[PDB]
Design an enzyme around this catalytic site. Structure first.
Site, PDB file in Angstrom:
ATOM      1  N   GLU A  11     -25.429 -55.809 -25.709  1.00 56.88           N
ATOM      2  CA  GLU A  11     -25.408 -54.487 -25.079  1.00 56.88           C
ATOM      3  C   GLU A  11     -25.478 -54.508 -23.558  1.00 56.88           C
ATOM      4  OE1 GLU A  11     -25.381 -52.287 -28.810  1.00 56.88           O
ATOM      5  OE2 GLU A  11     -24.741 -51.908 -26.751  1.00 56.88           O
ATOM      6  N   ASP A  20     -19.974 -45.680 -22.841  1.00 54.43           N
ATOM      7  CA  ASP A  20     -19.921 -46.833 -23.728  1.00 54.43           C
ATOM      8  C   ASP A  20     -18.476 -47.066 -24.187  1.00 54.43           C
ATOM      9  OD1 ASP A  20     -19.353 -44.985 -25.770  1.00 54.43           O
ATOM     10  OD2 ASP A  20     -21.226 -45.318 -26.844  1.00 54.43           O
ATOM     11  N   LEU A  32     -27.510 -44.748 -26.369  1.00 53.51           N
ATOM     12  CA  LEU A  32     -26.639 -43.581 -26.427  1.00 53.51           C
ATOM     13  C   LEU A  32     -27.404 -42.324 -26.044  1.00 53.51           C
ATOM     14  CD1 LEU A  32     -23.934 -42.247 -27.178  1.00 53.51           C
ATOM     15  CD2 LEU A  32     -24.813 -42.043 -29.524  1.00 53.51           C
TER      16      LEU A  32
END
EC number: 3.2.1.17
Length: 162
Positions: A11, A20, A32
């Site tokens: 990530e 993203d 998120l």
């Protein structure tokens, strides 16, 4: 290697609001914020998550706090889900991390939908499961990360992360 280091690798870390792989406002270590096209909405979510007016920028410590919460949330999601828990319980520690990784990326409901893959994993048919997992929007959209996660399921080692 552990689930936190694994997800850090997959990530990354960014301290200002970004989009993203799906175009969604995100921050920190793959956190998120919202699927809304509104940056303002994303900032409101961020401020709510952190507990202060951030105007889209957070610290490393704050990012790592959301990350701890998000990993916790992925594990608890697995354990409360009737489809995911038996599979998780059946797995060894390394493959457990692979399942947590998937849930972190696409959510409990998304992963619980992988019915045939989940069965092959519970059966410990690793090569078969790996083949099935790749027949997915998931794999096609993020193939390098999906490949690492699938290799982890296939081998039960950290080879794809070293």
């Amino acid at each position: 290697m552990n689930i936190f280091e694994m997800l850090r690798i997959d990530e990354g870390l960014r301290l200002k609001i970004f989009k993203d792989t799906e175009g969604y406002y995100t921050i920190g270590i793959g956190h998120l914020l919202t699927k809304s096209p509104s940056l303002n909405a994303a900032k409101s979510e961020l401020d709510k998550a952190i507990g202060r007016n951030t105007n889209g920028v957070i610290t490393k410590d704050e990012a790592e706090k959301l990350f701890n919460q998000d990993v916790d949330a992925a594990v608890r999601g697995i354990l409360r889900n009737a489809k995911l828990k038996p599979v998780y319980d059946s797995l060894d520690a390394v493959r457990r991390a692979a399942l947590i990784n998937m849930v972190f990326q696409m959510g409990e409901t998304g992963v619980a939908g992988f019915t045939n893959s989940l069965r092959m994993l519970q059966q410990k048919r690793w090569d078969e499961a790996a083949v099935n997992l790749a027949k997915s929007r998931w794999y096609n959209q993020t193939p390098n990360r999906a490949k690492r996660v699938i290799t982890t399921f296939r081998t039960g080692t950290w080879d794809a992360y070293k």
